[PDB]
Design an enzyme around this catalytic site. Structure first.
Site, PDB file in Angstrom:
ATOM      1  N   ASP A 189       0.894  -1.151   0.005  1.00  0.00           N
ATOM      2  CA  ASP A 189       0.048  -0.112  -0.101  1.00  0.00           C
ATOM      3  C   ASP A 189       0.917   1.187  -0.018  1.00  0.00           C
ATOM      4  OD1 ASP A 189      -2.499   1.422   0.432  1.00  0.00           O
ATOM      5  OD2 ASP A 189      -1.559   1.838   2.154  1.00  0.00           O
ATOM      6  N   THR A 223      -4.231   3.932  -3.824  1.00  0.00           N
ATOM      7  CA  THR A 223      -3.598   4.958  -3.188  1.00  0.00           C
ATOM      8  C   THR A 223      -2.527   5.579  -3.825  1.00  0.00           C
ATOM      9  OG1 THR A 223      -4.134   3.783  -1.035  1.00  0.00           O
ATOM     10  CG2 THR A 223      -2.781   5.885  -0.972  1.00  0.00           C
ATOM     11  N   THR A 224      -1.830   4.531  -4.319  1.00  0.00           N
ATOM     12  CA  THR A 224      -0.602   5.007  -5.536  1.00  0.00           C
ATOM     13  C   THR A 224      -1.052   5.865  -6.647  1.00  0.00           C
ATOM     14  OG1 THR A 224      -0.180   2.582  -4.894  1.00  0.00           O
ATOM     15  CG2 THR A 224       1.626   4.132  -6.378  1.00  0.00           C
ATOM     16  N   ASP A 272      -9.697  -4.348   2.476  1.00  0.00           N
ATOM     17  CA  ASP A 272      -9.916  -3.427   0.937  1.00  0.00           C
ATOM     18  C   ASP A 272     -10.881  -4.452   0.233  1.00  0.00           C
ATOM     19  OD1 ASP A 272      -7.913  -1.464   1.168  1.00  0.00           O
ATOM     20  OD2 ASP A 272      -6.337  -2.802   1.106  1.00  0.00           O
TER      21      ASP A 272
END
Lengths: 481, 359, 481, 481
Positions: free
Chosen positions: D56, D89-90, D349
């Site tokens: 993450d 998120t990346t 997730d």
């Protein structure tokens, strides 16, 4: 293990490529501020009191002792743009420079050098072909010649009196055309008076030897000869028998021959420049043999009025009024001798353009009108070729947009801002939309009378892309110290 | 102690294989890029501001002042190869360099030279038999000769009017062909006009009268024509031709490798090393195209071992295609000598375990 | 500013690969010498100036000061392998390195790390399929038992008594292996005489503390205590009423509690480790009686023999001959602490190997044989699996060539020669073909006796593989100082 | 001038923008190495030698000691991307970073930041609105939910057993949706065995203290007790009278109290985490009274089957079959603990992925499939806005193309090349065109199952534009007071 000589800087990977492109882009930065009708000249001071103030790109790149092994190539490119054509020399330089920078973008991203090479080559095919689909077919009319000849003179020092010079050109080119030939315009510069005194003399203009010889001949039969007239009378007797009232000798004359010719009322001059001897044989249509006993009425020039006026306390022999002046002389009077050098170089290019104009009733909308067009054409040409080439073509189109940008740059208007307006209007009116700095807004070149020759443009992209790419392939050079 | 004159360097044993191999390998990677139609002509600037733009490996090696003897022998490799036919000057150099690059590795594994060289010399003999065991025998015959001579004029400044030059070379060689003599074809170059105003002048020895607008262009028309005549001189001695585009190298490679497992022993590795070395040709080739060398290599040997040897690297398409179908053929002589001149050099080069100089 | 704070050593892509791989190589080669009967031990001395002379890789890594991230991963591989079966501790190490070495070479060429893992991971599953098919299943059976135990005793310092250590471990693990457990084996290192004096006691040995007590008790009624015997009459008196002639206290015993236990003829033993108490409750059937008031007659375990032997000149109680002794004691004997250390280290291994049999009979001809076979198979497998993976798969196998390579290495035999020969003779002599160091030449491992456990190899490949793969992914890691 | 205090760095002019851009760009590239199915997790080690190994982005940017004021901001962006949405998120970090790159390109050209901001902003709105036109409408369909939850598990560790975990996620989410609540799914991770044993319990899973307490209570009435049961029998008498067969105490239980509880057949546990107590009262419907005398037959939760089975040698208390089937427990059985660490994050997730999938019937083709689309859209949206704004939109579109590029990056394939194929195939097939790395070519993401939630993409552009641009304004921080 010294496989190379000491102090032998070597560049392999991206290094060479990057270092090479930069050197070319830099020079392009030093010659970018003199493009367009608002560009600014440059003063090359060769450490020795020498001051060369010109605007032409080539001349500048020829005076600057560049060390950049790359810029030298750039200086070679500009040279191939001044010989094969004339002006635009600058334009070509900025194209190759900016273009390479566009490629570097692709390379640093991962694109293989050679791959990008074909792109510009494939886009070049389209760019040139497009020029063929935008070339406005004009005529050899005087107006179109006066409009283009003037634009050529502009962007320079004489821009103050471009209107006048333009007139002298249109006449010098119209008189030498029968298949034009610029080598028929004798450019002779002379100081004194203002630049508004430059006239177009339809004949030779030298710079009577003995005070007993006539000084003003009505219709003088030019009996040009080479061999000296000294050891003398037998030589003077043969001249009067051949009906030679005005003998133009290449070498000096004997003191006892100047009194003999002065007796017959013969007007003979001595020590005439070799160039003038040839310009008098092609202008007045006379033959300049060698010996004296050989001359004959068959080698007599038909001048109309050969007088001697000292316009500036310097006796000048004007041999004007020639039957068919295939050798027109474009007299040029300027304040300073330095101003003459520039004016002369300006005309040499101004005349060139005209030659092209009459050698083909073709012309393209200048002021960046053509560029904005090709760029737009290539953009719609990239989705067809597809592949990594698509970028190459598009990049080539963006690189072409440097011309309009720079124009606004040398004018004082926003680069990007203008580019948008010009592009929008262009994608509406057509190939007739260009960048008119004199107005600070996108205008129709074809309307304002701003047009560029075909040869010029065509040669620009060629010499550019070709040489430009080669530099990109050169990933190494290997040197020493 | 000064066993030998002061300042006289003397590399010994391992200290020799290193400085010798690399130096040669490095010089082979310099002109390497100048291979294929995607060649990257370097702008050689001698230590005086000179500007030498060229693609030919020989011309480059004759401009770069070298000091290490090892790299000097290379400039000599391109001198002999460039004199024979002309092109492929970079080929023989790149190979000679790689062979040393793959050899040194084995030296790491501590594979005594004696064994290595032995495999190299023998492997050299394999390629020769291989080359002949797959060459395409084509006819004299004006038609064929033309194609051969044409392919020898399609890369130089004469390519402009190659067609004309071909008929000129074809005639000059077909006439002085008794084994043809390359000393019976007088070349009378005369500056002025275009290379199109040429005409062979006839005879146990004609007098070809070339024409060149410039002085440098005229001499170029003389050399290329001579090379165009050379290939014709080969169709008289070596009427064999193998597909280019790397197709050849790949074959000999796949063959040599297979032979390796059949020979076994310590020399079982060198055999492969030489075969894998031949892969550099098609590798560097596709590389000049910006395509994936590795990926290509995979699919290359793929369809190559499956459907004959007619497959080769298509630089224009960045993919593998049937060379034969495309009409891509290279004189067996061209390839024949290449592998030879290469292996040989590398061999004796590997025998050099010391060099008495002065500094 | 600084991308990362201070004191944060980072490494990205290849930069990291090189470091991780390198560190692992030196670490994998360091223990590489500790392989085979040519295993060259090492002397590691921690802060406390403690000298550790061991041949076991795990023991080495768990005593070496490792601070390198990737390097620590190797300590884990050896740790797990040592916890799985023990044998092959070094196998995983070296192999793990070779893999990374072959992989790194693939990247420098241009190959994607992704494919690397895939190719290696895919070959890891193929091998785990080849091993079970090629493996040589053996027959329990004291005849086959000694065979495997005899091939697990060599390669160490106690090779002089590979016959004794074989029978000793063959008897123990054959008295209570229900489902055998390596925890029911208690080894004791008693100094005195050579290892050729080692004995096998059917029970658990310890050290008493009272003399006047019964040194050799017949059918004893053991009572395991943990609560101190300090105040003492009612405590020791409540032990004589239950019939406990053998007291095994966990903590210390009061002098008055000893004199009383010495008067009741009850053999008392104080200072008994917590593990020795548990092992005494599962061997004689004694109950861990906390306090000294709740003990009864049903809490006393039966031990037919509890005498005081002074073997090696050190008193030791031998609780042997029980109803269901589930825990035996290996009485080791050594002339020096050094030899005693090595011996024990290897004894445990054999204990695990035997534990592998009780849960896996299969066995493979070690000595590199299996490695070469897998290499051969896997390689061929790669050729059957098209794609760039064919290269990765073949490279993976090439790693197995590092095992026999190390074998001939710690012997001074040219790997290049022995390997090539091995493969050739292996492709004809099949699996059995291996390398006999004692006599530099190919030889049938199955005949030579050298047989390793199938399960021993299995885990190795998997653990090592998955581990190495991980260290390769994390190609970018700064820290957080 | 002294407006600042000694030691106060000040960014001025372009300098600030430069450092900021590069800053955000650098950290953006470092995190770009873990994007995609071929990504690579990073191992961050803080001061205490801690070792955080995760994939993450957020967590990573939360452990890396960032000194770059800009990067720090990029850390706040990834945070707002993990708290509002989660996965990807990346993706965000890359967008904002690449975005600034396109801008700078323009700024260095002469373009003023403001005009550029308007350009991107103009594209943002349109972009967000395009995602509303390209969103795939489905429903609470169990099929699509399995696809999304599965695709989410991929690109990670559990990518080995996505099929299993995914299924459990769909079920747990289907039984906790009222309006989905993740706080109703207790994630319990346990070591031992493989991660293929993970099951889904419909109750509670605590990790009988006394050996005499029933190991399985049927209609077990839980008598939640918070106070301690030490300083006793009177407290046990009060429980038996309140009919409490299963007393789950939060504090320790006196040894003597357990004997009185087991003597009555009462199943009492001790030391239960406060968080487990509250989960036992909201599932079985029990009341947790502080003192032992505040409990009553009306504060006992109704349980169906409370059994204590071993989950790896460790007996766990399962209190399933609660009167309220809205409280499920997702037990996680796997190898090591560290493995379950990552996996537990995967489910967190997975549950969130399915959660939003049911709460929002949006499911756009991920894998860049959307990126490329929006990009081409803006490219054709920029000519309708023109002005320097045209550039902004374009740049925003070019910045959106980073996702697909990075995909071809982490995969190994040619970034640029692939981009051309995907783009050429996207404008031919539709919005369903994505970058499938497993096939090394652009495929229909909506056909491979690769789908992303609308919330993600939507929220993305939001958090990006805002912050990003703000980083172009802050041209000076100056640390003073």
């Amino acid at each position: 293990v010294k496989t190379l000589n000491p102090k032998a800087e070597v560049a392999r990977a991206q290094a060479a490529l990057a270092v090479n492109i930069s050197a070319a882009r830099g020079l392009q930065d030093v010659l970018r501020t003199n493009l367009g009708p608002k560009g600014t000249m440059k003063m090359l001071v060769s450490g020795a009191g020498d001051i060369k103030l010109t605007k032409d790109g080539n001349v500048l790149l020829h005076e600057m002792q560049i060390q950049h092994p790359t810029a030298s190539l750039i200086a070679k490119v500009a040279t191939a743009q001044d010989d094969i054509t004339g002006d635009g020399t600058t334009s070509n330089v900025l194209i190759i420079g900016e273009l390479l920078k566009q490629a570097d973008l692709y390379i640093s991203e991962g694109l293989h050098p050679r791959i990008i090479t074909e792109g510009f080559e494939a886009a070049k095919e389209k760019a040139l072909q497009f020029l063929e689909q935008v070339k406005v077919s004009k005529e050899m009319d005087r107006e179109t010649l006066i409009d283009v000849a003037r634009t050529s003179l502009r962007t320079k020092v004489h821009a103050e009196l471009a209107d006048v010079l333009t007139e002298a050109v249109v006449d010098s080119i119209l008189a030498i055309k029968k298949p034009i030939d610029l080598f028929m315009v004798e450019i002779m510069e002379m100081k004194h008076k203002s630049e508004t005194d430059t006239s177009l003399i339809r004949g030779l203009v030298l710079d009577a030897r003995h005070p007993d010889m006539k000084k003003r001949v009505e219709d003088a039969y030019i009996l040009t000869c080479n061999v000296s007239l000294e050891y003398i009378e037998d030589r003077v007797k043969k001249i009067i028998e051949l009906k030679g009232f005005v003998v133009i000798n290449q070498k000096g004359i004997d003191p006892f021959s100047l009194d003999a010719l002065a007796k017959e009322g013969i007007i003979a001059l001595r020590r005439a420049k070799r160039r003038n001897m040839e310009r008098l044989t092609l202008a007045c249509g006379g033959i300049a043999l060698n010996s004296l006993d050989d001359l004959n009425p068959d080698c007599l020039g038909h001048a109309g009025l050969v007088y001697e006026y000292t316009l500036g306390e310097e006796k000048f022999t004007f041999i004007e009024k020639c039957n068919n002046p295939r050798s027109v002389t474009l007299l040029i009077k300027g304040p300073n001798k330095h101003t003459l050098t520039q004016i002369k170089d300006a005309i040499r290019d101004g005349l060139r353009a005209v030659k092209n104009a009459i050698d083909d009733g073709c012309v393209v909308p200048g002021a960046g009108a053509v560029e904005v067009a090709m760029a737009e054409a290539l953009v719609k040409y990239k989705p067809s070729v597809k592949g990594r080439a698509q970028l190459g073509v598009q990049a080539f189109a963006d690189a072409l947009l440097i011309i309009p940008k720079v124009l606004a740059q040398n004018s004082g208007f926003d680069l990007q801002e203008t580019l948008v307006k010009v592009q929008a209007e262009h994608s509406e009116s057509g190939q007739l939309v260009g960048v008119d700095l004199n107005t600070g807004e996108p205008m129709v070149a074809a309307e304002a009378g701003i047009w560029d020759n075909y040869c010029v443009k065509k040669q620009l992209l060629h010499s550019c892309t070709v040489i430009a790419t080669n530099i990109l392939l050169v990933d190494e050079i290997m040197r020493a110290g | 102690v000064l066993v030998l004159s002061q300042n006289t360097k003397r590399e010994s044993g391992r200290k020799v294989q290193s400085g010798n191999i690399n130096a040669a390998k490095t010089i082979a990677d310099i002109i390497r890029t100048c291979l294929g139609p995607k060649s990257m002509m370097k702008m050689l600037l001698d230590p005086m501001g000179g500007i030498v733009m060229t693609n030919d490996g020989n011309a480059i090696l004759r401009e770069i002042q070298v000091q290490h003897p090892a790299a000097k022998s290379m400039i000599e490799i391109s001198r002999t190869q460039d004199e024979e036919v002309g092109d492929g000057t970079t080929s023989v150099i790149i190979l000679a360099g790689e062979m040393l690059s793959v050899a040194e590795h084995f030296l790491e594994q501590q594979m005594h030279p004696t064994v290595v060289i032995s495999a190299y010399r023998k492997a050299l003999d394999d390629m020769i038999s291989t080359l002949k065991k797959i060459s395409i025998p084509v006819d004299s015959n004006r038609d064929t000769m033309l194609n051969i001579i044409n392919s020898s004029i399609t890369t130089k400044v004469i390519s402009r009017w190659s067609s004309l030059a071909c008929n000129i070379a074809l005639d000059a060689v077909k006439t002085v062909q008794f084994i043809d003599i390359k000393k019976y074809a007088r070349v009378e170059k005369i500056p002025g006009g275009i290379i199109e105003d040429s005409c062979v002048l006839r005879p146990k020895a004609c007098t070809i009268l070339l024409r060149g607008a410039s002085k440098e262009i005229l001499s170029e028309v003389e050399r290329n024509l001579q090379d165009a005549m050379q290939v014709c001189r080969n169709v008289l001695l070596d009427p064999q031709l193998v597909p280019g585009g790397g197709a050849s190298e790949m074959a000999v490679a796949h063959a040599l490798t297979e032979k390796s497992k059949a020979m076994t022993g310590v020399e079982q590795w060198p055999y492969r090393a030489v075969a894998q070395a031949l892969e550099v040709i098609p590798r560097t080739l596709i590389q000049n195209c910006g395509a994936s060398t590795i990926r290509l290599l995979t699919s290359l040997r793929a369809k190559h071992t499956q459907e004959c040897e007619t497959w080769g690297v298509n630089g224009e398409t960045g993919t593998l295609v049937d060379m034969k179908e495309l009409g891509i053929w290279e004189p067996l002589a061209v390839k024949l000598q290449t592998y030879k001149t290469a292996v040989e050099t590398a061999v004796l080069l590997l025998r050099i375990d010391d060099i008495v100089s002065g500094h | 500013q600084m991308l990362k704070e201070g004191a944060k050593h980072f490494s990205g892509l290849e930069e990291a690969v090189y470091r991780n791989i390198q560190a692992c190589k030196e670490l994998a080669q360091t223990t590489r010498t500790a392989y085979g009967p040519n295993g060259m031990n090492k002397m590691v001395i921690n802060h406390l100036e403690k000298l550790f002379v061991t041949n076991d890789a795990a023991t080495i890594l768990r005593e070496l000061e490792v601070q390198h991230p990737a390097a620590k991963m190797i300590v884990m591989a050896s740790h797990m392998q040592e916890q799985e079966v023990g044998d092959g501790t070094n196998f995983v190490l070296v192999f793990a390195g070779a893999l990374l070495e072959l992989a790194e070479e693939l990247l420098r060429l241009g190959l994607s790390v992704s494919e690397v893992i895939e190719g290696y991971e895919i070959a890891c599953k193929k091998a785990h399929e080849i091993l079970p098919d090629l493996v040589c299943c053996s027959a329990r059976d004291v005849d086959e038992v000694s065979s495997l135990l005899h091939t697990s005793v060599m390669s160490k310092q106690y090779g002089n008594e590979v016959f004794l250590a074989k029978l000793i471990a063959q008897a123990c693990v054959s008295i209570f292996p229900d489902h055998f457990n390596v925890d029911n084996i208690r080894v004791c290192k008693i100094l005195g005489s050579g290892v050729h004096s080692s004995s096998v006691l059917h029970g658990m040995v310890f050290k008493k503390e009272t003399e006047g007590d019964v040194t050799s008790v017949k059918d004893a009624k053991i009572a395991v205590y943990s609560c101190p015997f300090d105040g003492m009459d009612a405590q020791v008196k409540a032990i004589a009423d239950t019939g406990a002639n053998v007291v095994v206290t966990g903590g210390r015993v009061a002098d008055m509690a000893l004199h009383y236990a010495n008067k009741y003829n009850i053999m008392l033993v104080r200072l008994n480790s917590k593990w020795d108490l548990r092992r005494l409750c599962k061997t004689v059937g004694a109950t861990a009686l906390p306090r000294l008031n709740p003990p009864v007659l049903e809490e006393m375990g039966h031990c037919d023999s509890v005498y005081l032997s002074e073997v090696g000149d050190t008193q030791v109680v031998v609780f042997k001959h029980e109803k269901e002794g589930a825990i035996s004691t290996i009485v080791l004997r050594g002339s020096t602490d050094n030899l005693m250390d090595d011996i024990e280290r290897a004894v445990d291994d054999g204990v695990n190997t035997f534990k592998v049999l009780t849960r896996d009979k299969r066995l493979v001809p070690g000595g590199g044989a299996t490695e070469i076979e897998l290499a051969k198979q896997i390689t061929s497998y790669g050729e059957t699996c098209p794609g760039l993976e064919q290269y990765a798969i073949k490279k993976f196998a090439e790693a197995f060539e590092a095992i026999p390579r190390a074998l001939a290495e710690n012997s001074g035999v040219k790997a290049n020669e022995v390997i090539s020969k091995l493969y050739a003779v292996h492709q004809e002599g099949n699996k059995n073909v291996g390398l006999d160091i004692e006599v530099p030449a190919v030889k049938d491992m199955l005949e030579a006796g050298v047989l390793d456990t199938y399960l021993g190899k299995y885990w190795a490949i998997k653990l090592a593989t998955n581990a190495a793969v991980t260290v390769l992914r994390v190609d970018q890691i700064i820290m957080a100082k």
